[PDB]
Amino acid sequence: AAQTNAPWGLARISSTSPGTSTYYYDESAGQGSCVYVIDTGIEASHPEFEGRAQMVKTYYYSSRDGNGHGTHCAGTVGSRTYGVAKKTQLFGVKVLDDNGSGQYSTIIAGMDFVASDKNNRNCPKGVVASLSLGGGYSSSVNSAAARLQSSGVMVAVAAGNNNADARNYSPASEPSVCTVGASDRYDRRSSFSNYGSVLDIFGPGTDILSTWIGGSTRSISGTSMATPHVAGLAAYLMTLGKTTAASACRYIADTANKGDLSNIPFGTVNLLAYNNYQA
Ligand SMILES: O=c1ccc2ccccc2o1
Ligand SMILES: [Ca+2]
Ligand SMILES: [Ca+2]
Predict the structure, then answer these.
(1) Cα of 165 to ligand 3 centre, how many Å?
(2) Which pairs are disulfide-linked?
(3) Which end of the chain is less enclosed by CB atoms within 10 A, N or C?
(4) Ligand 2 center to residue 253 CA distance, Å?
């Protein structure tokens, strides 16, 4: 399948070079997989989700995304026009308030929730969780991410936007999960992207067009935007049978575009998520 005039990030993950505009992907498109977006919620009624999104848990007064961030990330995972895995099932877990803030205790509860909830859902090709959030180091937050991964869910987390070593941020610094840095359309590390030995992979993160609340769209930047590209790619690969939840991060790193990025500090991987699609 080919989507012409795709958002640049989708084109990038299906090409060995920057500058293309077509997203090539297998028609299976993540069907049969499930991705939990743990964030400010998801506007499930957005036409771009085609009825494939639903809220399953909120830690606040409402399950509505009053912010937009969670809807944007979900859109990159799995919306028709802006998503990597266009037929996946999306579940929203609202652990961030409408200002995009949340306490560590709530974020941990949200991870433990998904570890249990996945047992109640029909996801034959596997389960992914996308966490476009983080804050200062916390061993308890890392431990929660490690448990989620251990339970059999492919966990992808944002490296953070401090232009710093991600070792000082959580859950980015938990080695067992897949920590995602951001790049721009010229294959440069995004100027805000954290880096360091704990990063596993890079994805498109600068100027990413996706869904927004009020049935709209908008372009924003962050490691928060790169993370759903990797989460969607994982869902897409599990559906194809190429990898499992336990090994998807390693498989993505193994099959990545290598050495294409500039401004990567010594000690940080130079690997860009790539779907290896061949028609
Ligand atoms: O869009 C965002 C806003 C804040 C933030 C903080 C830590 C990690 C990722 C983040 O993404
Ligand atoms: Ca290349
Ligand atoms: Ca890792």
Answers:
(1) 14
(2) 34-123, 178-249
(3) C
(4) 14
Active-site residue, from 151, 190, 224, 229: 224
Question: What kind of experiment solved this structure?
Answer: X-ray
Which amino acid is residue 60, in one-letter code? Answer: Y
Under 8 Å between Cβ of 234 and 34: no
Domain ranges of the chain: 1-279
Ligand 1 lining (C-beta closer than 6 Å): 69, 100, 132-134, 158, 160-161, 222-224
Q: Resolution of the experimental model in angstroms, please?
A: 1.9
Pick the CATH number of 1-279 from 1.10.443.10, 3.30.2290.10, 3.40.50.200, 3.30.750.24: 3.40.50.200
**CB 161, CB 223: distance < 8 Å:** yes
200 a known binding residue? yes
Rounded to whole angstroms, the Cα distance separating 243 from 266 reads 29
Buried b (16+ CB within 10 A) or exposed e, 73-87: bbbbbbbbbbbbbbb
Confirm whether residue 16 is marked as ligand binding. Answer: yes
